[PDB]
């Protein structure tokens, strides 16, 4: 178990919201299999 | 877009009904229940005997069942005990006296139902679907069908994403009503899901 390095530095109001506004709890992008972000240049096995 | 059924649009033109009895409103509902029962039972124990069509008619308190199939020898067995026991069981099912005619069908891969049964058989036994589609294509062209289109749909080859592949040659005029478009579907219960197959065969203008 290792400490997380938050990018807010010295937190003096609220660290939970600080870790939200840190990149750790960021919203994450999913690569669609088909649809909008659909095109794959090369396959997983090709 | 979605297509209209070729048979379903061509009943009144060129395709005969596969049930040609008459009924009033009183006997209609359990009549179709009886037809559904006989058809599922005969397809269940004629699944291995190359069945194509089941045409049934009620003349008067009785049932005539004509089975258009390609292997009447294995249908009738060893001097007809198979068709005799099927006759007695279907008489039990329909509650009326029964008699069965077996119609041998020339050119089984010119029949549309047997092409669907064949292609679903290779999709069960894991033969490569594209090869089997081609194999049906030169079957139709070698026996002289004027046109054929075969379509397969689903998780082809165990893919994670389902898709549809269809092959066509000759004329497949779905919009021409007088055309003999013998069309039929089937399903494959593969270990990776359900694979649908559809067959269109154009066999002449009228």
């Amino acid at each position: 178990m290792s400490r997380y390095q938050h990018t807010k530095g010295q937190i003096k109001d609220n660290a939970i919201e600080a870790l939200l506004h840190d990149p750790l709890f960021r919203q994450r992008v999913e690569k669609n299999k088909k649809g909008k972000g659909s095109y794959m240049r090369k396959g997983k096995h090709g | 877009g979605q297509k209209v059924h070729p048979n379903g649009i061509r009943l009144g033109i060129v395709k005969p009904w596969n049930s040609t009895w008459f009924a009033n409103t009183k006997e209609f509902a359990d009549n179709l229940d009886s037809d559904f029962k006989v058809r599922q039972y005969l397809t269940k124990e004629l699944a291995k005997a190359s069945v194509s069509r089941i045409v049934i008619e009620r003349p008067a308190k009785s049932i005539r069942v004509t089975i258009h199939t390609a292997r009447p020898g294995i249908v009738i067995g060893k001097k007809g005990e198979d068709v005799e026991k099927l006759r007695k069981v279907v008489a039990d099912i329909a509650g009326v006296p029964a008699q069965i005619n077996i119609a041998e069908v020339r050119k089984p891969e010119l029949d549309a139902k047997l092409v669907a049964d064949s292609i679903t058989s290779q999709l069960e036994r894991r033969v490569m679907f594209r090869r089997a589609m081609k194999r049906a294509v030169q079957n139709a062209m070698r026996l002289g069908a004027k046109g054929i289109k075969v379509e397969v749909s689903g998780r082809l080859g165990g893919a994670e994403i389902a898709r549809t592949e269809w092959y066509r040659e000759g004329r497949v005029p779905l919009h021409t009503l007088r055309a003999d478009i013998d069309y039929n579907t089937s399903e494959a219960h593969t270990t990776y899901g359900v694979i649908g197959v559809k067959v269109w065969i154009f066999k002449g203008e009228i």
């Binding site: 003096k12 870790l19 960021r26 669609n32 909008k36 | -």
Partner: protein, 353 residues
């Protein structure tokens, strides 16, 4: 008698759950040990360690005999219920009902003492929902989380009112501070401090790509804003000196060590009054700095624990709800987001997280 059967079954199940969460045999082991070194007499030759031993002894023995008498109560109420079903002795069945209610209330007092162990647990609370760095998806998730928490507060019976609500321009609300009033509100809601992980097919995205947004619920009790007491004449050091009559007043607070001078006015009394207001202002400033320093130290500790703030995970794509801290799971996402978190909050509160 069917509710009585279900009720005894419920008490048996919750007693087993309480034993599992409390680790009864381990506390019994320290109880036996504390009894042993109490039996050796040197422990009362040292005063303060006997103080600690008396405290831990009383706590351990009380928990142990409580769980033991609930075992005895469960078994003898079950046996006498079996008597009361067949013999149909109505007074003895009423005795069973009374003793069963007493046992249930006394185990309720035990689990009560465990779950509301906080000093601020009885007070009302300020509960805040804030969306993450995601966008409108996080905004919508914060808003409907606020809806769910309102539904939970109304179902519990806590009186709610929205102190502030910062909304998003498209949909949802960016942040919201809510006063939840009622007895034991902070104790009931104190396990909600942390992060919720939404995974769902986002409607705001054009392609229907699923989104993994985050929100935080932060609860803090309504502490009493105590009055700032005035300073003492002995605690002050008052000097007078010539301005640059010795009307200049230098007031020095000695126990902290802070001075304020004033020399602008001919009146020494005016100089002293301005110096005394400067004294009060600096004392208020230093008290605020001390409070902010303590808050920053607590934030240092909870930023150190960091990733542990991610407490809850809703996978709406696969339709599963997960508390990572207690590790518990369920599938009724619509009930969870309706506000049926009673099982989760009880699991967390018996965990002590």
């Amino acid at each position: 008698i069917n509710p009585v059967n279900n009720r005894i079954q419920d008490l048996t199940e919750r007693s087993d759950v309480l034993r599992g969460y409390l680790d009864y045999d381990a506390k019994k082991e320290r109880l036996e040990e504390v009894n042993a070194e109490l039996e050796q007499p040197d422990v009362w030759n040292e005063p303060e360690r006997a103080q600690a031993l008396g405290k831990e002894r009383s706590s351990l023995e009380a928990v142990v005999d409580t769980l033991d008498q609930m075992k005895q109560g469960l078994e003898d109420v079950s046996g006498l219920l079996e008597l009361a079903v067949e013999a149909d002795d109505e007074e003895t069945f009423n005795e069973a009902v009374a003793e069963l209610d007493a046992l249930e209330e006394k185990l309720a007092q035990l689990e009560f003492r465990r779950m509301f162990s906080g000093e601020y647990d009885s007070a009302d609370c300020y509960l805040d929902i804030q969306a993450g760095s995601g966008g409108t998806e996080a905004q919508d998730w914060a808003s409907m989380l606020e809806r769910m928490y309102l539904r939970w507060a109304e179902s519990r019976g806590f009186k709610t009112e929205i102190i502030e609500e910062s909304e998003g321009e498209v949909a949802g609300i960016k942040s919201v501070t809510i006063k939840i009033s009622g007895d034991y509100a902070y104790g009931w809601l104190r396990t909600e401090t942390g992060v919720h992980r939404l995974v769902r097919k986002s409607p705001f995205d054009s392609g229907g790509r699923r989104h993994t947004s985050f929100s935080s619920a932060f609860v803090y009790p309504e502490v009493d804003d105590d009055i700032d007491i005035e300073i003492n004449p002995a605690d002050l050091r008052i000097d007078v000196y010539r301005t640059s009559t010795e009307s200049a007043v230098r007031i020095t607070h000695i126990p902290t060590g802070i001075v304020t001078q004033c020399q602008n006015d001919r009146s020494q009394h005016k100089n002293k009054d301005q110096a005394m207001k400067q004294m009060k202002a600096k004392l208020y400033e230093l008290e605020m700095q001390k409070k902010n320093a303590e808050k920053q130290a607590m934030e240092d500790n909870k930023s150190d624990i960091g990733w542990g703030s991610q407490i809850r995970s809703y996978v709406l794509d696969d339709s599963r709800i997960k508390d990572l801290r207690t590790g518990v799971e369920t599938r009724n996402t619509q009930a969870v987001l309706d506000g049926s978190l009673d099982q989760f909050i009880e699991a967390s509160l018996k965990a002590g997280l």
